[PDB]
Amino acid sequence: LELDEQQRKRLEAFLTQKQKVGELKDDDFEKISELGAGVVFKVSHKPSGLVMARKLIHLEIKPAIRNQIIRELQVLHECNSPYIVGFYGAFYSDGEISICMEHMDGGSLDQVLKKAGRIPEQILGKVSIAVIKGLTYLREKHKIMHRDVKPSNILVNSRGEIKLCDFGVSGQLIDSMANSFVGTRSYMSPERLQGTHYSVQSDIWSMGLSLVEMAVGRYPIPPPDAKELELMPMAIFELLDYIVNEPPPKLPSAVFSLEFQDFVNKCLIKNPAERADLKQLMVHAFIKRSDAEEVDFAGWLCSTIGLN
Amino acid sequence: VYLQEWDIPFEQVELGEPIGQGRWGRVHRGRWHGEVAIRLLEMDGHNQDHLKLFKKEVMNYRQTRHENVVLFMGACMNPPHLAIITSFCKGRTLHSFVRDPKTSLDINKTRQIAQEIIKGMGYLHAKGIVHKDLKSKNVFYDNGKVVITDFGLFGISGVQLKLSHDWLCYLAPEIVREMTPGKDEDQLPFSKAADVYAFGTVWYELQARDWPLKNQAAEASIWQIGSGEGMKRVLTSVSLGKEVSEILSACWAFDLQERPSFSLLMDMLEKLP
Numbered sequence A: 001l002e003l004d005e006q007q008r009k010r011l012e013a014f015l016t017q018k019q020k021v022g023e024l025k026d027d028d029f030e031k032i033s034e035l036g037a038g039v040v041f042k043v044s045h046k047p048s049g050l051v052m053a054r055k056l057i058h059l060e061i062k063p064a065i066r067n068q069i070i071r072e073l074q075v076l077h078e079c080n081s082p083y084i085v086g087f088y089g090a091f092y093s094d095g096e097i098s099i100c101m102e103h104m105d106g107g108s109l110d111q112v113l114k115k116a117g118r119i120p121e122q123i124l125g126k127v128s129i130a131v132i133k134g135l136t137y138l139r140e141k142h143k144i145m146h147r148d149v150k151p152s153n154i155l156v157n158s159r160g161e162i163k164l165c166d167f168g169v170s171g172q173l174i175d176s177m178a179n180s181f182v183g184t185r186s187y188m189s190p191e192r193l194q195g196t197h198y199s200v201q202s203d204i205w206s207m208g209l210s211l212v213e214m215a216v217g218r219y220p221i222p223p224p225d226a227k228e229l230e231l232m233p234m235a236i237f238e239l240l241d242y243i244v245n246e247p248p249p250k251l252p253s254a255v256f257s258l259e260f261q262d263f264v265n266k267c268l269i270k271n272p273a274e275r276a277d278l279k280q281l282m283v284h285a286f287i288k289r290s291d292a293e294e295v296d297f298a299g300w301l302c303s304t305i306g307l308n
Numbered sequence B: 001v002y003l004q005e006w007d008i009p010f011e012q013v014e015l016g017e018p019i020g021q022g023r024w025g026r027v028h029r030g031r032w033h034g035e036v037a038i039r040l041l042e043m044d045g046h047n048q049d050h051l052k053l054f055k056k057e058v059m060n061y062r063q064t065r066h067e068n069v070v071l072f073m074g075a076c077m078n079p080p081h082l083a084i085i086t087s088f089c090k091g092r093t094l095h096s097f098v099r100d101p102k103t104s105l106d107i108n109k110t111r112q113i114a115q116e117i118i119k120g121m122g123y124l125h126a127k128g129i130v131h132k133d134l135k136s137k138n139v140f141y142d143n144g145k146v147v148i149t150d151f152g153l154f155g156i157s158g159v160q161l162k163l164s165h166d167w168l169c170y171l172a173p174e175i176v177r178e179m180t181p182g183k184d185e186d187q188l189p190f191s192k193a194a195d196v197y198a199f200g201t202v203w204y205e206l207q208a209r210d211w212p213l214k215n216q217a218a219e220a221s222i223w224q225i226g227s228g229e230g231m232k233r234v235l236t237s238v239s240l241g242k243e244v245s246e247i248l249s250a251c252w253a254f255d256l257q258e259r260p261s262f263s264l265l266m267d268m269l270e271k272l273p
């Protein structure tokens, strides 16, 4: 599975630190500051002095399905790879499902993008490698798909790692909660919007659309104006109808390499059958390039936002 | 409104156990002697224009009485606290009724239930009242008789986006295209035509005992509903009967103006098996 030694040594170190904490409840944590909402908080755990990230979601529903949600979610103990954020535990408390996760020093790429303005191609190659490896790991080891890929769910650290969060493990939580939200933006594939059977192909599209937003600093659809590109108020249905009935986004031909331009073009093919799968994407020229490249990711991240 | 302004003589009403929640306050069982349903709302707007239109609507519901519309009894507004009191419906919501294994739906029972609902929607429309929230959860079935609940209630302005799937199925394309974050439900284009579309979905429920769209993401449903392609597909995907499907295709008409009136729909339901 191309498991590196330094990765496998940092995977063991957190699995043995995973039993030092053991189980937890609600009084073991203490707040620090506001991470964001879509809520998650920076948290101090008191039994084990490790600082963790606790995301809270408010669900008042019949307790029979709350128990089915928690037992489906405990499978995250089996999901462990260098490209998925560290999972601590899941429990119901005060009618608020709380997920305790690794704290990521750099936050989400959505935060990173707003502070960085734009994200260079050299480094978008590294996150793309991490996502396909993380998505192959998820589809192969547990036979699930992500269903919610977007920059605000890609997390980075000053340690130099890349890992994704908020992936769909519980089918009941999907039918009961996650489906009811609709944001001002949509990262959903065109075949999911038309309600066909979608696979990880739908996740490829999300990755492609996310890459375009990070590369240009703007949510891609509707495509920017001709002069707006040089510098760098819509209802939700006009957004969704554009994704289905209009050409997909593409990177500007003047700034980025063919390997990058073609990479996103293969990710953003509307038909998922012709869209690139993960096998085809792992061997794509843009991946072979950045995988063999030499970037110091920790240096860019800490000098972009001001960490150490 | 001090409740003494109503023709239902009032000395005292008592709150009882709550019976489920929703976007529109908390509904309590209660006793007027008869059991009643009491809905407790709160006006965050607190603005005189909200209450003037509220006073307009509740005084209009005072004029309503029909065997297929729930009896509106009184409303009292001690702002920001408001309360709406309707007759309590014994029996099961039509939603939970069709989804029962034990329930025995048939080509006749569905026609009879639907004609009842059309009569109630006919009356409400005759009085110029748009229901704005016709769905299976707001229709009650006790033995023979069928009652419509929760009509006109969306015209109220009380205290990202979250949209239930069950509600989306009953929403006409005119409405879901206008949905957007920061836009309140009071600004959506409900209408008599949007009401007959919601009758299309409730008729589908009478035939299929389930939603016309399986529990998808909201975004997925929003496009399918608003494009009219969603209802096109489910119309073809599984058929029940040419005569039965004719009224379903008519009610779900993409152009609202091509949707029948309720008085017309009474005749269509008559020329059936």
Ligand SMILES: Nc1ncnc2c1ncn2[C@@H]1O[C@H](COP(=O)(O)OP(=O)(O)NP(=O)(O)O)[C@@H](O)[C@H]1O
Residues within 6 Å of the ligand: A035, A036, A037, A038, A039, A040, A053, A055, A085, A101, A102, A103, A104, A106, A107, A108, A109, A110, A111, A152, A153, A155, A165, A166
């Ligand atoms: N496990 C985590 N570790 C560190 N930061 C996190 C974590 N989860 C979320 N965040 C931060 O919290 C914010 C995102 O929270 P979240 O509730 O996931 O909403 P969202 O990602 O913006 N969109 P959505 O997930 O669909 O609601 C960003 O500022 C992230 O950096």
Ligand SMILES: Nc1ncnc2c1ncn2[C@@H]1O[C@H](COP(=O)(O)OP(=O)(O)NP(=O)(O)O)[C@@H](O)[C@H]1O
Residues within 6 Å of the ligand: B019, B020, B021, B022, B023, B024, B025, B027, B037, B070, B086, B087, B088, B089, B090, B093, B137, B138, B149, B150, B167
């Ligand atoms: N007149 C009534 N008689 C008896 N039960 C009622 C009445 N009106 C509402 N209810 C019940 O009260 C609960 C909440 O009603 P309501 O607030 O209208 O939500 P709902 O219609 O069930 N679905 P929603 O409107 O989307 O929240 C449900 O269990 C209803 O069946």
Ligand SMILES: Cn1cnc2c(F)c(Nc3ccc(Br)cc3Cl)c(C(=O)NOCCO)cc21
Residues within 6 Å of the ligand: A038, A055, A073, A076, A084, A085, A086, A087, A099, A101, A164, A165, A166, A167, A168, A169, A170, A171, A173, A174, A178, A181
């Ligand atoms: C739909 N759905 C089904 N299962 C889910 C789940 F386990 C989730 N949490 C999660 C999973 C893995 C890891 Br590693 C870390 C976290 Cl925090 C989320 C989620 O976090 N949504 O973000 C809120 C957006 O509305 C959603 C799930």
